[PDB]
Amino acid sequence: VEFSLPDLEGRANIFRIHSKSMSVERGIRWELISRLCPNSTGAELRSVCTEAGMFAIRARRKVATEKDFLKAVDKVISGYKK
Amino acid sequence: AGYDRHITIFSPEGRLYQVEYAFKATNQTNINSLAVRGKDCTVVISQKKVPDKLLDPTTVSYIFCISRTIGMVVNGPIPDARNAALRAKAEAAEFRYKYGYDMPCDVLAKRMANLSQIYTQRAYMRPLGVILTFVSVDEELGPSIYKTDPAGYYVGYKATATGPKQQEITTNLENHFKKSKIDHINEESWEKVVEFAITHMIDALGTEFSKNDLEVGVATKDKFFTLSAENIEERLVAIAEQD
Amino acid sequence: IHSRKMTTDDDINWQELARSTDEFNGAQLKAVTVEAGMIALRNGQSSVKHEDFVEGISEVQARKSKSVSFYA
Amino acid sequence: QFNPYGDNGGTILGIAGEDFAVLAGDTRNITDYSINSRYEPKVFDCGDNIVMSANGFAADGDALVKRFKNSVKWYHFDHNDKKLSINSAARNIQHLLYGKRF
Amino acid sequence: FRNNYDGDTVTFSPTGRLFQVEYALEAIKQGSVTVGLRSNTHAVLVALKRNADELSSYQKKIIKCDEHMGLSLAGLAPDARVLSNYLRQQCNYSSLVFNRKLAVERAGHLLCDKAQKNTQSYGGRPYGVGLLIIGYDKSGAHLLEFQPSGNVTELYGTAIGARSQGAKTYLERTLDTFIKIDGNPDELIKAGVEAISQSLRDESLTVDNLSIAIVGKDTPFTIYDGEAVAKYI
Amino acid sequence: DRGVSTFSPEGRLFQVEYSLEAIKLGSTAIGIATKEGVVLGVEKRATSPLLESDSIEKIVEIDRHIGCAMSGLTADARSMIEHARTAAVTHNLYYDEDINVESLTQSVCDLALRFGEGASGEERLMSRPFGVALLIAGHDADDGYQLFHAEPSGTFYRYNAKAIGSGSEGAQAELLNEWHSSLTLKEAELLVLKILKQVMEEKLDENNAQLSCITKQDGFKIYDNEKTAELIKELKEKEAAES
Amino acid sequence: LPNEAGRLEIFKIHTAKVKKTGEFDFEAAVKMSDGFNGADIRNCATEAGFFAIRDDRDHINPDDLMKAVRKVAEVKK
Amino acid sequence: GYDRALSIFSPDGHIFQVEYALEAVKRGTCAVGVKGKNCVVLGCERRSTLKLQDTRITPSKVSKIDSHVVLSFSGLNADSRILIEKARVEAQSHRLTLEDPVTVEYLTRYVAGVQQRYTQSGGVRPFGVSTLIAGFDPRDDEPKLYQTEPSGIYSSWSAQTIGRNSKTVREFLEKNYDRKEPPATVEECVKLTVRSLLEVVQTGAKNIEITVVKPDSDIVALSSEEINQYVTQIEQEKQEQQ
Amino acid sequence: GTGYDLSNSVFSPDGRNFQVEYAVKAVENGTTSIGIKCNDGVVFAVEKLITSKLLVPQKNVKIQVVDRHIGCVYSGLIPDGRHLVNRGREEAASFKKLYKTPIPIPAFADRLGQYVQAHTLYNSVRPFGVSTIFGGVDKNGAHLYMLEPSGSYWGYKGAATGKGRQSAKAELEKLVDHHPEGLSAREAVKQAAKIIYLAHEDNKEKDFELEISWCSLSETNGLHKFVKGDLLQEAIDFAQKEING
Fold this sequence. Notes:
Chain H: Its main location: cytoplasm. This is part of a larger assembly, with nine protein chains of nine kinds. Chain A is mainly alpha-helical. Chain A contains four helices and no strands. Chain B is of the alpha+beta class. Chain B has a single domain, classed as Aminohydrolase, N-terminal nucleophile (Ntn) domain (Glutamine Phosphoribosylpyrophosphate, subunit 1, domain 1, 4-Layer Sandwich), CATH 3.60.20. In chain B, strand 9 and strand 10 form a beta hairpin. In chain C, helix 3 packs across helix 4.
């Protein structure tokens, strides 16, 4: 059974799924978030939603924004490299 | 670099693993040799065996005639022996054109040693395993024996042996030469020279060997010849004619 | 031997399937029978046709599986 | 000493017309007063509506032609059987001719 | 270990040949199914062309080397081209030097030698591509199988690519019949299409995947390409 | 380092696989070939006041009938262009006419094979393969308007439309729905802008996008900043009136 | 490693307790080895015997013995 | 043969050797170029800590590539000579052959090209240097500023900064320049350049070397005396904005 | 031990490099081929494996000619054997031009020997994994030689190599003893065919097709020619008569 590398359509679904439970303020398209991943594993995806929430809590927020999700992709992938 | 025995470079200890292993297990190929000097000949006896009845033992060669006058006795395997033979033969011939003169044992020995050394430093070649004993009866020195060994080391002998009955051969000749006060025996005919050789051989290796189990190469002034099978039995029977 | 134990539609040709599998071992021919049944399980069939087995081979048996036809 | 270069005669005539063109040539091949051939095609079809004749000295004709025949073949392979244009073929010859002049 | 003998192409291993070489034989099966068949007067090549997409256009699985010769590839593309150029070069020179077309046999043996040289060279590699090379020379009709380690076999019929064993069962039965039809192109051609669709078992056949090439006693290298293969199914 | 002749159990070389990894990290290049032209569009990206954003573009002209847009490493695409210009120039001199886009891709792909230690088949002078993939678009008088995707692996396929880059998975999917066989040059360019807007996390300006076109009365023609912006101006209003 | 002499003695000794048709030429058998000590020689004996269980007999030919020593040599050193 | 590998792929689609080349530049000294719309200013560090250097034969950071073109760098001097030499030859090659003064774009392509080669080609490694190339095209009064990396990539930039604390100097510069209103007068564009480069050199007003390039071969290096004066002034400005 | 399994550019303590051992092994992993010296000639025969009816007779004969009077047959892997021979050929053409005489069988042994030995001094060239049995008639008598993959070679009276090496030496050693060396060249085809039959008994998973060739100075006149027709056909019968099954 694979748990290696999923598709663009696939990355989108796993993002959509962790952020339901969260409050959010509008302007999110999952597709856009997915786009910034050149290659991921399931571990990385879980890290994008949870990290995106943290930028909001520092500013003191309950909601998540399109900006936050982008910011979390950039951090996670780059650390994974090397 | 790499490592010290995956490519040829110095060991931790300043040794070379490849030359020492080249000394050892290239004489254990069911080969034992001796060379002794005549008065006006040079004699070599060397073992040479054929394990099939289906292997023509004529082609089986480990005394080679390098030129019409020069012989080279190889201790070690036929893949190696022909790399050294090709070099020897070429060197012999080249020498003959260029310098106008027949090739001495010593010059050939020295040239081959230096070449092996270069191949020892190379990281994409090996030193050959073979031990090469070059024989003739030079008109510039008399009967001669010069031996090279695999490390790029070489040195002249008056009588030599190889294979682990080295001690036995040496001691019998040493005691003999200390008594007679000479390192060459005196006798004209080649026949009596081969009988002297056999005497020391039989005692020392503790056995006698068949015609096809021996190969005897004789150096004479301006000829080197190998003795036919009947000719090698004639000699073994001739000492036993005495008995 | 495999096809006694379990239902089949009694049309399945071992020789033909055998040409279709390359470098299969005995245990792996037994795992194809299981996968042929997993097709069958999804399909709502209680037996296996030839097709059902062909599809079984395509899926993993985990040591060798004949399905190669990709390259553009 | 040596110069193989001479002459072998023959005559060719090319006429461009309204939709058509001819390459007419005699079939006599000589070296001096001796007859080398009394039929030997002196117009030859290289393919692609291109017919060709190298009149003069034979020895150069044969060479010029062989270099060019392999170019017709290589043009096809390397460009998926796209047929050779009269103008393009003319440029290709120019380069051949110019390639030996030593 | 695997990793111990894999790194350069100059090592043998206890198996009798290098691991990498087996991986080159494996690649052929990945690439396209091509069947080869002959009678004794003509020889027929049938090949399935694959592309990647709807809006992709096919990659050619027949490369014509001469007006009496061509070959099919199966496996790695980039090597199949480097080989087809070499064969072009070999062909032409034969014609320039010897006035000679280049026999299938003659070509196979030159190609083999080139293959040994690139499997003793350490930076070099097996090609990773097998080829079915067809011709009609003055040796008769021919099919040869080339493998990228230098294995060259002359055959009546064979297949490389997807379920080779698949096609081989078909051919071996219908063999005795079709090969004694000597002087009728169409039958041998019709047997080729009948075969190739039964090797398939996770693909289907269609007109513009299929492409047929025949060479023979009265057929100079001719491809039926796209539409015109319908009339051989 | 890493083998240059060492394949996977499938038989796909490490170096090829690694080639595929650099490609996926560039900015999208999208081509649609139509019946009146080929459109090639790129996302140039980056907007800064410390950046000259309209002095850099990713659509470079090879010839008066051939362009290429790239995606992947840009430094690598310079060696590919130097080889490609030389080959096209030498063919225009010999036969006076246009070189075929498929023909060009094969000539380039031949020199993509060198990397590593040499062969005895080939002299391998480089160290890695090229880490850029290209969409080469052109015109020829014998197949009209065409679009080609060259992979650095060796494979080159003709397409009617293809996208490459990071955002290609989405992009291609859109291309198919929008694609039909009565599509024209003017529609295709508008549509390119739609695709580009959708996938951006920004506003589409001509300092993050560049258009280009092919018409056969002018060859390969760059759709200039001034025209591309006028097209962007028209987009924003019309889209923002469907909402 | 044995002698030629050592191999002969041990072949003769092993086939003495054994039941056989025909006088055996141990001398060939020795050639067909190259340095087999007593344990290796025993495997050759039983090997011959296997074709004799099949040939439905408690005796063995010269013919069996030549084949037998060679098959054991090939399957190892 | 030493045409075999010495630069290999990453699994991430980078190259190991290019990632390591950029690190040497960062540890290094800082060079900057800021544009007016009349000049292009280049600042280069000379932070002599020790006083036992004799500084008329201590290497400079400013090279002529051509009489209207300069190259500045941050990185290993040893590698930079090798690049600097090939770039002078290329300016003279054009001059000889085209009968024409050199255009900035082609030179940049050339500088990019040797570095690009050495990543691609085997038994060589890329240089340890990033550069800034600037100058003016012939019969042209608008400034030109290019950046090249030892990856071999290249770009134009309105202003760019390299070496140690590149972040800090970009970030600052961004607040003090607009493309719509860049500076007209030499004095104020130089004031800004000296002020950015003060903030990273620490103490420096003889350790900062300014060279201001106006159109077509008016290239003039401002001196210590002049620089000390702008630093005084900056110490007056910082208590007018308090 | 180690380094000697990947290289040949350094020397084993065993006196025998592990890579060299692997080369011999692939020889025994081929087919049987043999060679018979006789009182005027040499006769060569090989077992050609039949797997399928998709293979064609006498185009996948493993007998390949060099010069005019040397026939060369092998056991091991096909590509190694053909490349080795193609090199023999080239040296043979060179020989003929230069010395205006055909290439000897002893000369050819040396030519092959030096190409193999060269690849066993270098780790940068990989050697051959075939044993090639060859021979002919020349100006200086009849010769049978066998080349082994170390770069060891000698002249033999009889030779075998391959899967069926043992069974072949047995059947040969009886026939050679009985005769002075192998009697006539005619007789030798019949004898050969018996040897192949015994050698088949180690295969038995494939059928075989018998292929013989000869080089004879009394019934071919010094040329290498195939043995086919009547002579091959009497030989199949002789084998099947005495050898039963």
